[PDB]
Structure 1
Amino acid sequence: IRNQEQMKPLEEKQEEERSKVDDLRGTPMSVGTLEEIIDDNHAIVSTSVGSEHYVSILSFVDKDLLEPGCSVLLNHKVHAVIGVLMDDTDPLVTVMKVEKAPQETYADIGGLDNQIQEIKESVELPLTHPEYYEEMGIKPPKGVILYGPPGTGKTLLAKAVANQTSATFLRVVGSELIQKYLGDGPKLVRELFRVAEEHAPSIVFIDEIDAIGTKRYDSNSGGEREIQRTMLELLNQLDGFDSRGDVKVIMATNRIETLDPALIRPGRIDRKIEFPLPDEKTKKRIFQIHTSRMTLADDVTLDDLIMAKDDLSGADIKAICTEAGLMALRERRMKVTNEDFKKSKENVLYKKQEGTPEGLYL
């Protein structure tokens, strides 16, 4: 009954309002742009029509949804605001894909275990535990650096981590920020930061660059100016605003001794993560998972191929199997033999080396 009472005057009032908007809404409706916001009940507008008319805003749309430089709808002869335009373009920034929860996990690699705890404690752990950060009173590191011969576990570990962590992953290719155009490169780094802030919490994966390698002793040079001009703005963004979790940074570089200590800045980055070289046991572990996928046979001697191997990371190993698997496929058999493994192990050995040895230190 209380409802009925509100309802009796309301229904008509409800219709009347809809009639009133329709009068404004009436075709056509021209897009135009709000130049700037003059807070003493004014604003600057640029019209590509002709007439402009200073109006009071409707109550559906407010000025709190108006931003400077925004697109809005104007009528073509009473030039008034029906609504703000709701059609926005593509992020124009440098190469990015955003992905929520990727397929892969970190249970597939093995024997690498220690490194895996390091990223764990930094990134994953505060999300899991508020109050452990409160006791200590501090943030886990803003960002980490993963360093090794290009992604054989660096790349693997990142993919895995995004699923775990359950926030948006954005992967940016850093070389692509470099442009030989005066405006372009700086605009991009500032758009990259802009994009982060909206999507927060978010993970930033920075793929290695050439441009983080050079600082010299000048702060800018008559050489390629842009690479350092850009390098600086990376720093300004970082040392201007610290995140505990709003942005998490994964940085990647082939060698970290290329980097600059300016770039690190202690108290943002405290963690430097190093992939050990191939260690003999590890090779067998990594392998056992790769063979499982594939056909296997009772004439395979798993150790013998691993033993024959020395200083080869998981990628070549993943590769050997794939190569061999192709040979088999040509034979139109799904049975694997020793022979297959031998030719593939030889091809990859042939290609990496032509050097001479520095051993025999005994």
Structure 2
Amino acid sequence: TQCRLKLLKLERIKDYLLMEEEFIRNQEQMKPLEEKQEEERSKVDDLRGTPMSVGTLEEIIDDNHAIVSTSVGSEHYVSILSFVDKDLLEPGCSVLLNHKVHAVIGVLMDDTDPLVTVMKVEKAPQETYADIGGLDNQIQEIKESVELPLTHPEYYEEMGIKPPKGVILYGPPGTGKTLLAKAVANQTSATFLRVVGSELIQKYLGDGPKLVRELFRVAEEHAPSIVFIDEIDAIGTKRYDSNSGGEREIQRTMLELLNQLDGFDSRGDVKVIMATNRIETLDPALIRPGRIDRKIEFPLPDEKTKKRIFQIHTSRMTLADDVTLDDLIMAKDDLSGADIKAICTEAGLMALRERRMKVTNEDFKKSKENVLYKKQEGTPEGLYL
């Protein structure tokens, strides 16, 4: 609190000085730039010809040509002349063409995919590491399997042969499978692409094998990388029609995965991380190793583990030092992560009704008896069963 504060105040102030110093450089201070670069720009823009019509640079031919596809609608076989070199152009990028007669002027700009924008979500877990404790042994494993062959090459090189190519995170929700993928990805800072399994089965047919191959192929280009496939139970569970359920849809998606991961087309040291809450839906071929390598199983929380699982939920909320953990272990046990989330939410819910804007032991206790009953009730009790 007070110990932190002097340094915090200083960091914000160091950053202020940094902002203010930029303004003086762009406006007044020049030495190599001068009036001279201003004129270089004018002279280059007029020769270059504004508007510049966008193209995409697929590949460069060394003889003073390039093969461009103009983005207007009809492609052109241009020359590489005027303010760029063959090597200065880079593949899969957006380039400037002279509008009057198309020769490729150059690459200032890069082209991002339309696909990647939607898929992508930023890397960082909202529950900090070493506070996703509780099955603490398990948390370590993912750091070893996906993160490590990319972070540290030393062990792998001495070990020899093929590295890992995935992990599968499975078992009851609430043991934090999403938080783990995000941690390793954060650390490496490998582009984290994220798609829910339900996107694999949508109304249009063959979208599933299509999305998954494009997603991977994009991961290889933007490599090293982490692909997260969140909650692949949907394949069978969902259908918009007869064609969208059933064997053709289920097979095509599974079949694509098999070729993509270790098969002919392969992948680099790009890892796929799969979250699944049921491996009942998943086959023995995607639970096969060497395209999954170590599988991580989370079991139901143990009596001692349950106290550590409860702490994580309590940390996101307000920090308890007045909750009796024994009462929770005594009342229910060998119930999911999801049950510990259920006790927490219900306490917050009763406090909300009063307009009490805290949770205390009292809110946890009052809600706790109804929640245990409620767990059993969630699955049918019928008339009187």
Whether TM exceeds 0.5 here: the answer is yes
* Aligned-pair CA distance for 1:96: 1.7
Q: Tell whether the 8 Å contact from 1:203 to 1:249 is kept in structure 2 after alignment.
A: yes
* Aligned-pair CA distance for 1:128: 4.6
TM-score relative to the length of structure 1: 0.72
Distance 1:8 1:283, change over 3 A: closer
**Separation (CA, whole Å) in 2 of partners of 1:50 and 1:144:** 43
Distance 1:215 1:79, change over 3 A: closer
Distance 1:26 1:232, change over 3 A: same
Q: Tell whether the 8 Å contact from 2:175 to 2:298 is kept in structure 1 after alignment.
A: no
For residues 238-274 of structure 1, give each alpha carbon's deviation from its aligned partner in whole angstroms, at most 9, with x where no partner exists.
Answer: 1246989731221122222432233344323232221
* Aligned-pair CA distance for 1:317: 2.0
Q: Tell whether the 8 Å contact from 1:61 to 1:84 is kept in structure 2 after alignment.
A: yes
Q: Tell whether the 8 Å contact from 1:37 to 1:44 is kept in structure 2 after alignment.
A: yes
* Aligned-pair CA distance for 1:70: 7.3
Distance 1:189 1:342, change over 3 A: same
**Separation (CA, whole Å) in 1 of partners of 2:27 and 2:377:** 91
What does residue 167 of structure 2 align with? 144
Q: Tell whether the 8 Å contact from 1:296 to 1:336 is kept in structure 2 after alignment.
A: no
Distance 1:334 1:91, change over 3 A: closer
Q: Tell whether the 8 Å contact from 2:57 to 2:92 is kept in structure 1 after alignment.
A: yes
* Aligned-pair CA distance for 1:25: 1.9
**Separation (CA, whole Å) in 2 of partners of 1:290 and 1:2:** 48
What does residue 28 of structure 1 align with? 51
* Aligned-pair CA distance for 1:174: 2.2
* Aligned-pair CA distance for 1:46: 7.6
* Aligned-pair CA distance for 1:132: 1.9
For residues 100-120 of structure 1, give each alpha carbon's deviation from its aligned partner in whole angstroms, at most 9, with x where no partner exists.
Answer: 444432422434133223223
Q: Which runs of 5+ in 1 are unaligned?
A: none
Once the two structures are overlaid, the 10-residue window that deviates more, 188-197 or 298-307, is 298-307
Q: Tell whether the 8 Å contact from 1:213 to 1:258 is kept in structure 2 after alignment.
A: yes
**Separation (CA, whole Å) in 2 of partners of 1:3 and 1:211:** 54
* Aligned-pair CA distance for 1:176: 0.5
What does residue 124 of structure 2 align with? 101
**Separation (CA, whole Å) in 1 of partners of 2:346 and 2:218:** 41
What does residue 351 of structure 1 align with? 374
Q: Tell whether the 8 Å contact from 1:208 to 1:254 is kept in structure 2 after alignment.
A: yes
Q: Which has the larger radius of gyration?
A: 1
* Aligned-pair CA distance for 1:203: 1.4
**Separation (CA, whole Å) in 2 of partners of 1:292 and 1:166:** 25
What does residue 181 of structure 1 align with? 204
Q: Which runs of 5+ in 2 are unaligned?
A: 1-23
Distance 1:302 1:336, change over 3 A: same
Q: Tell whether the 8 Å contact from 1:34 to 1:72 is kept in structure 2 after alignment.
A: yes
* Aligned-pair CA distance for 1:148: 1.0
* Aligned-pair CA distance for 1:196: 0.5
**Separation (CA, whole Å) in 1 of partners of 2:212 and 2:146:** 23
Distance 1:62 1:253, change over 3 A: same
Once the two structures are overlaid, the 10-residue window that deviates more, 198-207 or 348-357, is 348-357
Q: How many residues align?
A: 362
For residues 11-44 of structure 1, give each alpha carbon's deviation from its aligned partner in whole angstroms, at most 9, with x where no partner exists.
Answer: 9999998787455223443346779877776667
Distance 1:360 1:116, change over 3 A: farther
TM-score relative to the length of structure 2: 0.69
Q: Tell whether the 8 Å contact from 1:297 to 1:337 is kept in structure 2 after alignment.
A: yes
Distance 1:41 1:240, change over 3 A: farther
**1:323 aligned to 2:346?**
yes
**Separation (CA, whole Å) in 2 of partners of 1:71 and 1:202:** 23
1:8-87, aligned counterparts within 5 Å? 21-31=44-54, 56-58=79-81, 60-64=83-87, 72-84=95-107, 86=109
What does residue 186 of structure 2 align with? 163
**Separation (CA, whole Å) in 2 of partners of 1:69 and 1:294:** 46
Q: Tell whether the 8 Å contact from 1:172 to 1:205 is kept in structure 2 after alignment.
A: yes
Distance 1:81 1:212, change over 3 A: same
State the percentage of identical aligned residues.
100
For residues 113-147 of structure 1, give each alpha carbon's deviation from its aligned partner in whole angstroms, at most 9, with x where no partner exists.
Answer: 33223223323333453222222113442111111
* Aligned-pair CA distance for 1:219: 18
CA RMSD of aligned residues (A): 6.8
For residues 306-346 of structure 1, give each alpha carbon's deviation from its aligned partner in whole angstroms, at most 9, with x where no partner exists.
Answer: 31223333333234234323433544557866653343123
SS at match of 1:285: helix
Q: Tell whether the 8 Å contact from 1:101 to 1:166 is kept in structure 2 after alignment.
A: no
**Separation (CA, whole Å) in 2 of partners of 1:297 and 1:12:** 64
Higher relative contact order (CA 8 A, sep 6+): 1
